[PDB]
Structures are given as structure tokens and as C-alpha cells.
Amino acid sequence: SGFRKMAFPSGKVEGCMVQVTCGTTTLNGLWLDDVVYCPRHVICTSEDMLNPNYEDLLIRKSNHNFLVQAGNVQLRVIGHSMQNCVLKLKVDTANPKTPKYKFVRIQPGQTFSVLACYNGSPSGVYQCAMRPNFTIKGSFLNGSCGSVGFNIDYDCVSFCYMHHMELPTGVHAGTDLEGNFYGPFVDRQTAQAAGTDTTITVNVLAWLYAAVINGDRWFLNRFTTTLNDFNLVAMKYNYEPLTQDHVDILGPLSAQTGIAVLDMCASLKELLQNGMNGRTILGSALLEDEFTPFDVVRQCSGVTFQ
Amino acid sequence: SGFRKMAFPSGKVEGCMVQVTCGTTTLNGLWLDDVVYCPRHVICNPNYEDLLIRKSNHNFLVQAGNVQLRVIGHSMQNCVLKLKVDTANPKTPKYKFVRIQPGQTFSVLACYNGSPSGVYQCAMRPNFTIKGSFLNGSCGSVGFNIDYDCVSFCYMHHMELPTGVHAGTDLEGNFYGPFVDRQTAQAAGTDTTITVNVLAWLYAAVINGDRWFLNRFTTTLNDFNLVAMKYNYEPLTQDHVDILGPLSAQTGIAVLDMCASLKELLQNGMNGRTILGSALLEDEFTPFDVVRQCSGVTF
Ligand SMILES: N[C@@]1(C(=O)Nc2cncc3ccccc23)CCOc2ccc(Cl)cc21
Numbered sequence: 063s064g065f066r067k068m069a070f071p072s073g074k075v076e077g078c079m080v081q082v083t084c085g086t087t088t089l090n091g092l093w094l095d096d097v098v099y100c101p102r103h104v105i106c107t108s109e110d111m112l113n114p115n116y117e118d119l120l121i122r123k124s125n126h127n128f129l130v131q132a133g134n135v136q137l138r139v140i141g142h143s144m145q146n147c148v149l150k151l152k153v154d155t156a157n158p159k160t161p162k163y164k165f166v167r168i169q170p171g172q173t174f175s176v177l178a179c180y181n182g183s184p185s186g187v188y189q190c191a192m193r194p195n196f197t198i199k200g201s202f203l204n205g206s207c208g209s210v211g212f213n214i215d216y217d218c219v220s221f222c223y224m225h226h227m228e229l230p231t232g233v234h235a236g237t238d239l240e241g242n243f244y245g246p247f248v249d250r251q252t253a254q255a256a257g258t259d260t261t262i263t264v265n266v267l268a269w270l271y272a273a274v275i276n277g278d279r280w281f282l283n284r285f286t287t288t289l290n291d292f293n294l295v296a297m298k299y300n301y302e303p304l305t306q307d308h309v310d311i312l313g314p315l316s317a318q319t320g321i322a323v324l325d326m327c328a329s330l331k332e333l334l335q336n337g338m339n340g341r342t343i344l345g346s347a348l349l350e351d352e353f354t355p356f357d358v359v360r361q362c363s364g365v366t367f368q
Numbered sequence: 369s370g371f372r373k374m375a376f377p378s379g380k381v382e383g384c385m386v387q388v389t390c391g392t393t394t395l396n397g398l399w400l401d402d403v404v405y406c407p408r409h410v411i412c413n414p415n416y417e418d419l420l421i422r423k424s425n426h427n428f429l430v431q432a433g434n435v436q437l438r439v440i441g442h443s444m445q446n447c448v449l450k451l452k453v454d455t456a457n458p459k460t461p462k463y464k465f466v467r468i469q470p471g472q473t474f475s476v477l478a479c480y481n482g483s484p485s486g487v488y489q490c491a492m493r494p495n496f497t498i499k500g501s502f503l504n505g506s507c508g509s510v511g512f513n514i515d516y517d518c519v520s521f522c523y524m525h526h527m528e529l530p531t532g533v534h535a536g537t538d539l540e541g542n543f544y545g546p547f548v549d550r551q552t553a554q555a556a557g558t559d560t561t562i563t564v565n566v567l568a569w570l571y572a573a574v575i576n577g578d579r580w581f582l583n584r585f586t587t588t589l590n591d592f593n594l595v596a597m598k599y600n601y602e603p604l605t606q607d608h609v610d611i612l613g614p615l616s617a618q619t620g621i622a623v624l625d626m627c628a629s630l631k632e633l634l635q636n637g638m639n640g641r642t643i644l645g646s647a648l649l650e651d652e653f654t655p656f657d658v659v660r661q662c663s664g665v666t667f
């Protein structure tokens with residue numbers, strides 16, 4: 063019983079974190095095999111940030127300009143290349159702690175754990191979701207650049223995010239591990255803003271199924287809805303449209319609890335209309351959207367508390 | 369910017385988790401040096417001394433990854449079983465066993481079959497339970513804090529109470545709360561809100577640019593404590609006021625000034641507003657957790 067925002071154990075990622083310094087800029091790098099991956103803005107000197115020409119800045123650098131530190135050991139850079147917004151530093155030592163890993167690009171609504179780091183040293187771990195507006199609501203201070211997001215389903219680390227910047231509203235933007243930004247963001251200090259964000263509907267439904275599994279049904283009602291009528295109502299509350307793929311994905315939770323997906327949609331519509339009336343759902347007074355259907359299945363019991 | 373429920377990095381603890389099997393019962397153990405610590409109910413009105421004397425070392429199957437450790441001795445200390453093994457854990461971090469107080473927070477590395485599954489942050493409630501997330505087989509999972517390079521183990525999971533909350537012991541086997549390790553009628557007592565932690569979280573909200581709840585008013589500690597008693601909030605002591613000193617100096621809001629804000633929030637609610645993305649007053653961040661997250665301390 064219980065339901066917490068649960069991160070993956072961070073040990074496999076901690077053994078990959080390094081400090082990368084280029085001139086006066088210091089940030090974090092991810093050391094996998096003989097390559098250290100880090101944001102390419104480590105080569106910018108703050109003024110450069112308005113309109114940096116990364117190709118022009120990088121050509122003026124040699125391997126010895128990049129100082130990489132793994133614990134109290136200096137790694138030697140023997141090559142460098144830029145792939146999109148990531149710098150790949152070839153080092154002369156393969157990381158003996160390299161876990162089994164993959165680079166994966168995620169879709170909005172997907173969750174992942176973030177190992178926040180400063181100076182190549184891990185500070186904390188928390189759970190995050192890729193917002194529909196492609197930002198993440200993280201907890202990052204200056205120097206956190208290069209911290210990574212990941213999942214560890216079945217002892218393989220799937221790296222999905224590398225931290226690059228903080229937008230004016232306090233939210234965060236970054237890239238996949240191939241250096242492609244999530245969202246329309248650029249690694250420039252030009253005027254940029256997060257678009258209007260929306261609630262991840264499929265995740266809220268998953269969390270309502272988690273509440274039923276843990277024993278709570280107060281919010282259910284005798285009604286159902288069509289998918290189209292649900293979306294027409296949900297769009298009015300700034301909720302993401304629910305697609306047939308989302309209905310399919312919720313199939314297992316629907317079968318475990320005996321509540322049809324469109325019947326859970328009717329409960330959500332009513333919650334949006336009425337609010338919670340002094341009640342809570344899984345210790346929350348707000349509808350939670352940072353648990354996916356997969357996260358609920360991972361954490362919750364396979365037996366509903368009837 | 370941002371404020372999340374953040375756990376300590378779990379790597380130093382992951383390298384200590386093992387699977388302990390005795391008969392049909394399988395749970396988790398903590399392997400430090402040449403000893404594996406686990407709940408004594410793995411041997412299971414139980415007379416633990418009588419049940420343990422009937423066991424031999426070879427009855428305890430301990431597995432660290434895909435390697436079987438051999439048990440060469442066993443002893444009980446309160447509600448923890450200490451299994452002496454022939455191999456010292458080469459991954460043993462610098463550590464201490466500490467007993468925490470209600471209101472203090474810690475990270476939990478939830479495990480099943482000696483394999484870590486997740487990490488989350490929680491607080492020892494004033495009623496000595498924790499609002500964890502544990503399923504059958506999670507017994508022996510541990511709670512900890514990290515100070516510099518030293519892991520301070522403070523909790524070992526033993527059981528789930530009927531309300532879905534959890535109970536356990538420190539690493540010396542002393543339960544937190546009036547609980548016993550047996551199948552008998554037990555219940556969590558009425559819980560209260562950790563006042564000093566709510567104030568710490570309000571300071572975190574102010575640091576993050578959430579100031580709508582601030583007001584021109586102040587209060588005495590005695591008048592605030594009358595209000596705290598009314599809403600099932602723990603009393604705020606002069607020690608708590610002292611502990612909040614740094615956050616008070618950073619934000620320019622006196623501790624008693626923040627108390628008048630909390631009093632108004634208790635008497636009037638949030639009125640459709642949120643604080644740090646929450647519609648409830650959050651009490652599972654200590655003042656130290658706020659300072660650490662708003663300063664980027666590393667391990
Ligand atoms: N290094 C920058 C940044 O956002 N850095 C921070 C990241 N995360 C969190 C931060 C919190 C506070 C201050 C800074 C933070 C500094 C500001 O200009 C840009 C612009 C573009 C890019 Cl790609 C990076 C930055």
C-alpha cells in the first residue's frame with residue numbers, strides 16, 4: 063500500500079557522472095565507455111550565448127583545452143566532436159562502471175528520474191515528466207547543466223534527457239542524448255518562453271486507477287462518456303486530448319479494477335466540474351499527472367483492494 | 369529554480385542490498401562488512417529466541433546478486449537478526465546507525481528479492497509511522513541520509529499497518545512507535561502535521577518566488593501554539609524557531625512573521641491558490657532539506 067513519486071535507484075548513473083571544464087565554464091558530463099557527453103554550451107563564454115557559432119568556437123579548441131575530472135582523477139581528452147547540441151569528448155580511459163545502456167528519445171507525458179549534479183557530483187534524485195510543452199518542472203540551480211534523466215526498466219539504463227537550460231518561468235529545457243532539443247528551444251540566450259502547458263490526461267486517468275487499486279472509489283460515478291464528449295469537456299480545462307492509443311494503453315488497469323476507461327473518463331469529467339470538496343486522492347488535493355500507466359503498474363499491487 | 373521531493377543518491381546503499389531466505393519467507397538484508405542485517409520475522413505469538421535456537425547457519429540463504437554468501441553465525445539484537453557471513457562486503461560505504469526523531473526525513477530504497485526497485489523521500493510521522501510505498505516482499509528495505517561521504521542508516525522496514533502506512537525499526541532493531549513484530553491488532557495513532565517542516569516549505573516557496581501568503585502581521589509563539597493545537601499541528605518550540613533562523617535571514621521574514629502567514633492559511637485556506645504546485649500545506653521537508661536543495665549540496 064501507499065503511492066509515492068518514486069525514482070529509479072541512481073547508482074548506475076552516479077558511476078557515470080564527471081565534471082567538464084572549458085575555460086571558466088564548469089558543468090557535468092556523462093562518461094559511458096570512452097566518451098564523455100556534455101552540453102555544447104560548455105565552450106561558450108557567456109557573451110557568446112546570444113548568437114554563438116558553435117562550429118567556429120569548437121574549431122579553435124584543442125583536446126587539452128577540455129579538462130575532465132572523474133572523482134579525483136583527471137581523464138585525458140583524445141578527441142572531440144559535436145552532434146547537434148551535445149559535445150562528445152573521446153577520452154583515453156573507458157569507464158569501468160559503464161552500465162548496460164541505451165539512448166532513447168521520449169514523448170511528452172513520459173516520466174523519468176533526474177540525478178541532479180554539480181561539479182560532477184550527484185546531489186539528489188527526483189522523478190520528472192516531459193510536459194506537453196516539452197519543458198520539465200525540475201529543480202536545478204546554476205551548474206546543474208549536463209545532469210541527466212533516465213529510466214532503468216530491467217537493469218538497462220535508458221538515458222532520455224540531458225539538462226541544458228532554465229527558461230524565464232523557472233521550468234527547464236534540454237535535449238535527448240543525441241543532442242536534439244525537446245521542444246522549440248535553442249542553446250542561445252535569445253528571448254525564449256515555454257508555450258502554454260496542459261495537463262497530461264492519460265497520466266491523470268492512470269493515477270485515478272492507482273487510487274482505486276489502493277482502495278479509494280469516492281470519485282467514481284454511475285455515468286459513462288463518449289471519447290469525443292470527454293475531449294470536448296477536457297479541452298476546456300486545459301487537458302491534453304485523450305486518443306484511442308491512450309484508451310488502449312489504459313486497458314490493463316481497466317481490466318484489473320473492473321472500471322471501463324470511458325467510465326473513468328466520466329469520473330474525471332465530474333472531478334474537473336466539482337473539485338475534491340475537502341477530500342484528497344492518494345494524499346493529494348490536486349489531480350496528479352506525473353505518473354504514467356506504466357509507472358502505476360510498476361509501483362501498485364497486481365491485486366485491487368476491493 | 370524549482371522545488372521537488374528529492375531523495376539522496378542511492379548508489380552507496382544499492383551496493384549493500386541482499387536477498388535473505390529462511391524456509392518459505394524471502395525478504396531483503398543490508399550487508400555491511402561481514403554482517404547481513406534483516407528483520408527477525410524472516411525466521412517465522414512468536415517466541416523469537418525459541419524459533420531461532422532451532423535454526424542452523426545453513427538454513428539462512430543469503431544472495432548478493434548471483435552469488436550465495438555463506439552464513440557462519442547468527443544473533444538477534446532487538447527486532448533485527450544479524451547474520452555473520454564469511455565475506456566482507458567490498459562495497460561497504462562509510463556508515464553509521466542513527467535513530468531519528470519524528471519530523472526528520474530520509475530516503476527509502478525500496479527492494480524486492482534483494483534488488484532495488486525505487487527510491488523515494490519520506491518523513492518519520494509524529495505518530496512514528498511512515499507513509500511509504502511498499503508491497504509484500506519489501507521487508508528489510510532501508511531508510512537513510514547521507515552526510516558528506518557517510519551513509520547514516522536510520523530505518524529498516526518491517527510491516528504495513530491496516531491504514532496502509534508503515535512501521536519499522538532503527539538498525540539496532542528498536543521499533544519507531546508502539547509497534548510489535550507480530551500478527552496482532554495494531555493501529556497507527558492519530559497523526560499530526562509537522563509544523564516546523566511546513567514553515568520550512570513556506571520559506572522554500574518564498575525563495576522560489578511564491579509570496580501571495582505573506583502578510584504584514586506577526587504573532588507571539590504562545591498565541592501561535594494555541595492555533596497549532598486547534599488544527600492538529602505539532603507545537604512549535606524555541607528550538608524550531610532557532611533552526612529556522614537561516615531561512616528567516618535569507619528571506620527577510622521573521623519566523624513568527626511566517627507563523628502569522630501559516631495561521632491565516634489554517635483559518636482561511638488557500639482560496640483556489642497553490643504554493644509550490646500544492647493545494648495542501650506540505651510537511652515532509654525539514655529546514656535542512658530546504659537549505660540543501662536551495663544550495664546544491666553534493667555527495
Ligand atoms: N547556462 C544557462 C542556463 O540556463 N543555466 C541554468 C540551467 N539550469 C538551471 C539554472 C538555474 C539558475 C541559473 C541558471 C541555470 C545560463 C543562462 O542562459 C542560458 C541560455 C541557454 C543555455 Cl543552453 C544555457 C543557459
Ligand SMILES: N[C@@]1(C(=O)Nc2cncc3ccccc23)CCOc2ccc(Cl)cc21
Nearest residue numbers: 063409502503504506526527528549550551
Ligand atoms: N510480513 C507482514 C507485513 O506487514 N508485510 C508487509 C510489509 N510492507 C508492506 C506490505 C504490503 C502488503 C502485505 C504485507 C506487507 C505480513 C503481515 O503480518 C506481519 C506481522 C508483523 C510483521 Cl513485522 C510483518 C508482517
